[PDB]
Amino acid sequence: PIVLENGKLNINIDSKTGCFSVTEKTSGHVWKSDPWENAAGLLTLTDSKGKKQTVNISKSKKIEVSKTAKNTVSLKFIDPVFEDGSVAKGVSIATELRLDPNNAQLDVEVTEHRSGNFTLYDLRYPARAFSLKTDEDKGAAVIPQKQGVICPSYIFPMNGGRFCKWDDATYNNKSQGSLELFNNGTGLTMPWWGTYNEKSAVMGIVDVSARPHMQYNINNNGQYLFNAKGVMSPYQRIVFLDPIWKLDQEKGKMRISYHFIPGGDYVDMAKVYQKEAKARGHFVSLQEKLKRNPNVNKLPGAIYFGIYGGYPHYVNMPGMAFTFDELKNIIKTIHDDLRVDKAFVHAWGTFSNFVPHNYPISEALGGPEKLKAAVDLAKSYGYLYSSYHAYSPMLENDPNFTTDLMQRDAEGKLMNTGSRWARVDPKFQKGLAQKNIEKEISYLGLEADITDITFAAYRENGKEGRIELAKYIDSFNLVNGTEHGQEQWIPYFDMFEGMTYLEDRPLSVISHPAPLFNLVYHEAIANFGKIQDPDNEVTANGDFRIKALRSMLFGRGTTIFFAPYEFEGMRPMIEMARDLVSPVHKETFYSELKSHEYLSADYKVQRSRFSSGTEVIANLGPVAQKIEGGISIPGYGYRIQMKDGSLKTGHFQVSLHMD
Amino acid sequence: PIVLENGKLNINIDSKTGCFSVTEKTSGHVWKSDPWENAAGLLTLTDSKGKKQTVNISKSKKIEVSKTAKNTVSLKFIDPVFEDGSVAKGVSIATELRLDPNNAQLDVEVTEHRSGNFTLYDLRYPARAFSLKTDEDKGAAVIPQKQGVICPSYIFPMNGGRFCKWDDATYNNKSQGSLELFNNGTGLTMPWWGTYNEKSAVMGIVDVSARPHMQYNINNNGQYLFNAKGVMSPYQRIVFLDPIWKLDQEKGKMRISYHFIPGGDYVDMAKVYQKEAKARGHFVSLQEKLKRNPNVNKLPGAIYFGIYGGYPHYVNMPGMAFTFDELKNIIKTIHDDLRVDKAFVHAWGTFSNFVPHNYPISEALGGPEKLKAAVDLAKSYGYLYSSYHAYSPMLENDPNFTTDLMQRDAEGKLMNTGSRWARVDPKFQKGLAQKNIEKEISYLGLEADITDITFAAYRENGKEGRIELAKYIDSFNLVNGTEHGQEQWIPYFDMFEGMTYLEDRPLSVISHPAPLFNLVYHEAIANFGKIQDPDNEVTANGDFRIKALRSMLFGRGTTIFFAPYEFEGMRPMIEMARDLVSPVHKETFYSELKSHEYLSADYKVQRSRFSSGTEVIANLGPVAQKIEGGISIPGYGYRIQMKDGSLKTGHFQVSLHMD
Ligand SMILES: [Cl-]
Ligand SMILES: [Cl-]
């Protein structure tokens, strides 16, 4: 082998294949190259007939590996070979491995690619690296899918229904696939991922300029590679996560930085990234935000209430719209009867035109003075208030619909024809906001704003116009929120509505929620439940029992999101959130989520520690379980140590009243 | 126009296009032909270049429409034209429309197709027929997707989060697609579907010999057709369901029979089908089953308990496997402490080999005598008992794994390499069951059996071997169940585990559960909740509150499916099922589900009436709502009128106990 080495790592590079292993010297843990095919990389490209095929670059006609500097090895893979034995002449991939001279940190970069008369598409590089061996390694893959998850590398006790679905998925196509960076769908919210066992951890951080996808393989033995051939896989069940470099699209630097952490797990990974997040400029603390705007302290302990009037979808829809008097009375009841001390009231349906014309205040719902009376009541209670706003939609049912503000592609065709909520080109969105937002703020005396859609993702197309809008909104210095968010938007907002979990998502049945994003960013952005999956709805992500406990563990706020006709049914949930979640949310709001742990074999009992001095232990399953010191946590129960040393213990119960 | 007419229907057939309208003469409602393109049919076929294209068959070069009998119109569509104006010379499609002389029934059949030098694939015929106009018709599409759903043709009040998902799905690809018949995944469990408004209903029943797919379009304006062109749809939002004849594979008769019901809805449609089910031989009543086997009377009021010991997935898995003494104690606790009077105990993990070798009784778990003691205990209480059995798997982790009993295709390649649970060719399965099942029956004195996997679907490949196993099992005259089921298997079993709902399914955000299967088959086959989504798990399909109420409305039994370590956490739910669900299940078990109705604008308050003289009203949402007479049904509440005149009223409560 060729060798790169420092005080912490030894990298062994195979001259013949370009594959590498990483020995973490302190533990003797060796991270292995591809256990299945000894493939350094997997490259998808067209053949001479123009059919896409995926090849092992380690089978190329020529492979050149050399040390080109003390801590750099240069590799070159020349003329890959197709399945049928023909050669992709003139195709080459060049890469570098660069060891930090001091730290346990390896940079891996794809530095050039040549396509000849072929077309190159995906490159998995390194391929099937940093794997865990299922049922040998006791650890997990770590994936910042929205708030984040882990995927254990072994089978463990769990509810029998869940166990069937989990195990089964590890033998079919549910456990393999890919995810993308910085969307509000199924994708990742931070540019890293990793694997750990009981000895060591590795993560990879993707260069800021690049947008690889991430391939996963969760305990799968690769049977998916053999089904079309009708044979059984000869490979072993493993866990891996690989970068997919999109060679046909990517113009950035195709670099991933691997960090090796002895005895580390997902918390340690998160903290490594937190330092990078700060270097990248995303980290603007809620303490800095509170210094700029004292009204940010209306957020700790506040329930986020969304009163959904059928808008933006419809204007004054019968059986859904609220009047402004009705809004006022919901506000009053929240404060006077349900004793809610702090709240963020978000009223969906206050305008008589469709977004993106967020005006005038609707005469049919009572007019301006009647809305002002609602808002003033809220402000009298120290609640925050915002209308629903959006500057990105262009809706088919809007009488003012036009394609004039939609974007066109290089061929002159309309973009986002199938995505109605994100049709207005961002380059127009600041101008739309400017039409009325300052009038609303002046007329209502607003202290807060929430703006939908535009900041839910961080794609390249249109980003300049989105930044312009973000800066415009931020210039008002209101306590402000937006739908979902991404790390890149943290500087401009105080809270994100969402950054939790989709209901139906890849990896659902073979992962556990982990507060990855909040382990990084809790001190910098507040988050609340998503409006589609609020704390009052029973979904794949739980009922109120589960959601309330998870809120405290993860450091998010309560979301009660309702049509007006449901309000009386919200009362119990509001009370329970007020009693249990709100004081914990208050105490921990500005703090760091220092650590999170799973404390039971089924992963349902967890412990979170916040730099406020607050410790939350909760049991998200139905059966009491013991942890350390033989302490028992009831099903759907909690034990919380507050800053002041007091202890709160308790549990939820579901009962049946029979008359 | 050519007309077919009787006293109930007028069929108006356009002689230039082949499109037809149907006037239902009692209500006067007119079902229109394709509102979008005036297409009589949509045919997918390869072009001169071999690229598949879809074409409107009404644009064919020659269309021949003639009245060939009093009540038959014959159509021929000759030389379809491609996008580019080129012709598919030698291609033709012939159809017939046959009006029943007396009844409001129309048979539609594709009687011939010729391909010439082209290859034909899908044919939608009739295309976009029997549609509902969104927000003008107040009705629904009716789809027997597993237990069944309806898809309303208008927007209505509901929870705000649900509303956003619902409306949004009508404008993207979530509201269009296709489903297949007789699978245990996303598909249909009865060969019919339909549409209704406030005046009239139509359904179509597919010929017994055919396997069309079904296309859906739920309030979608056809934007999916235009996204690639980057233009806005010019079509209106409508609801339709079309048959998709797979011309490349279908050997049966491509006939659908349309039945027209003035004032009808999904209940009337289910009852039309019920007549056809009986004609097809699927309907063997529970009453007949009870006459054959008096032990069937151990099912009414019984909780289905699955004790999941990590088998079949693993043998004797630490932390999941139960011993036979442990199983005995669980059974004892359920009866003596939790006062469950009737139950079906299903123990997953009683053998020391992997399925499909369902023997011997495991020595490691205690041996035959200790299993007998647990079974005898169960029998002394009157409970039904089965071990887990399966004759279809061939598992990678089984030391005895071989490919010898796997099916191979015409190229000699293994089939089902991707489906571990369904690998043994059905032709072998009877033999595998024969190896030990009679030894088990005799040793344990079994009164019952549940067999997993084999009867979850009704596919053509392997059907004969499945039938042979069903008949073999049924020859024992045991109270018996199977996973999921299908209508074709009703004659052989007393119960099905499942026939409810997938958690993640197409149409989930744009449909309501409706008890379609049970509206047809409740008197013939009992069902219970699916082990993956049991009444103790909180999922997309609800928590215990919601599941228990739906169980009573739809006429299914309770499923408690748990790993042994969870048992103590099951107690409250077992109690509540005992007190609430079990007596209603007991009373209604053999009865007809006569009617189901949605009584609230949000579809959450419902009413079912059983021929036992039992009426169940329940509210599956959080807020109290009023029905007729101003009677209020509490959130998560019920009002049940029993045959004995008694009225049961009550509701679930979730409380927080702070110590
Ligand atoms: Cl969360
Ligand atoms: Cl159900």
Numbering used by the authors:
A (entry chain B), B (entry chain A): 35 to 693
Text from the published report:
Thus, these enzymes are exo-lytic α-1,3-(3,6-anhydro)-d-galactosidases which cleave the α-1,3 linkage between D-AnG and d-galactose on the non-reducing end, releasing D-AnG and odd-DP (degree of polymerization) oligocarrageenans. ZGAL_3152 forms a homodimer and the monomer has a complex architecture with an N-terminal distorted beta-sandwich domain (Pro35-Asp299), a central TIM barrel (Tyr300-Lys620) and a C-terminal immunoglobulin-like domain (Glu621-Asp693). The dimeric interface is mainly formed by the interaction of long loops from the TIM-barrel (342–357 and 430–459) with the two helices protruding from the N-terminal domain (η3 and α2) of the other monomer. The dimer is also stabilized by the swapping of the C-terminal strand β36. There are two predicted active sites at either side of the base of an impressive crevasse that is 60 Å long and 40 Å deep. Numerous trials for obtaining the structure of ZGAL_3152 complexes were performed, but they were unsuccessful; however, buffer molecules found in the active site of each ZGAL_3152 monomer likely mimic monosaccharide units. In chain C, a Tris, an MDP and a second Tris are bound in the potential subsites −1, +1, and +2, respectively. The residues interacting with these buffer molecules (Cys198, Lys208, Asn218, His347, Trp455, Leu536, and Gln566) are well conserved in ZGAL_3152 homologs, suggesting their implication in substrate recognition. Three are located in one monomer from the homodimer (Asp486, Glu517, and Glu531), while Asp202 originates from helix α2 of the second monomer. Asp202, Asp486, and Glu517 are strictly conserved. Site-directed mutagenesis of the four candidates yielded soluble inactive enzymes; these residues are thus involved in the catalytic machinery, although the structure of a substrate-enzyme complex would be needed to determine their respective roles.
